[PDB]
């Protein structure tokens, strides 16, 4: 709940080392902001691991929608290059009759 907020709370803490108005505070300040910030980020991954595994197992259709979505986008980019390749194939035609 509100996990962006404590995530973005550590954002301005990352500016605490940067903005203000003997080195040991700096090494700590740039550390514990970041280590909690990677803490606050990796759990969102596991939260996202939770949320789309929920969508993975509660319904099988959003799995196969995105499976079609990745292959169609592969289907275009496959077709995107082959007649590009063919037009390119037409390119070394006249490049080679120059002699």
């Amino acid at each position: 709940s509100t996990l962006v907020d404590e995530l973005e709370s550590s954002f301005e803490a990352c500016f605490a080392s940067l903005v203000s108005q003997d080195q040991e505070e700096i090494r700590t300040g740039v550390d514990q902001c970041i280590q909690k910030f990677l803490d606050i980020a990796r759990q969102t991954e596991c939260f996202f691991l939770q949320k789309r595994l929920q969508l993975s197992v509660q319904k099988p259709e959003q799995v196969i929608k995105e499976d079609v979505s990745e292959l169609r986008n592969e289907l275009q980019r496959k077709d995107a290059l082959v007649q590009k390749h063919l037009t390119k194939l037409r390119h070394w035609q006249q490049v080679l009759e120059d002699i």
Partner: protein, 122 residues
């Protein structure tokens, strides 16, 4: 569909994280007319950072608009016509992969012909 939105949210979180390291990488290059270009660059970078912040807030609301069902249903315990389209196009894309495979094999024969040309050209 909503799983794609959760993937988009994850990738935008990665986008902000990469944005953070690229800001720290860019700002560390300057210490004390070359100064104007770096500050204009960082101003554009923080403008795009603010745009990315607001768009991740938008997609965070978009992914959080729909969740009732909680976690711990997710652990895998041991105890319609779109599928026809998937089954028919899987072997078509495999056949396309093989059709380009013979073509690139012919090009392999061509490049094994051409590498011996410069090998004993002199």
């Amino acid at each position: 569909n909503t799983a794609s939105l959760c993937r988009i949210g994850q990738e935008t979180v990665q986008d902000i994280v990469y944005r953070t390291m690229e800001i720290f990488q860019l700002l560390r290059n300057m210490q004390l007319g070359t100064y104007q270009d770096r500050l204009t660059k960082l101003q554009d970078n923080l403008r795009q950072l603010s745009v990315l912040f607001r768009k991740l807030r938008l997609v965070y609301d978009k992914c959080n608009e729909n969740d009732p069902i909680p976690v711990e249903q997710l652990i895998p315990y041991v105890e319609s016509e779109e599928r026809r389209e998937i089954a028919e196009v899987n072997k078509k894309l495999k056949q396309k992969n093989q059709q380009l495979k013979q073509i690139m094999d012919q090009l392999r024969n061509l490049i094994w012909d051409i590498n011996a040309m410069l090998a004993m050209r002199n």
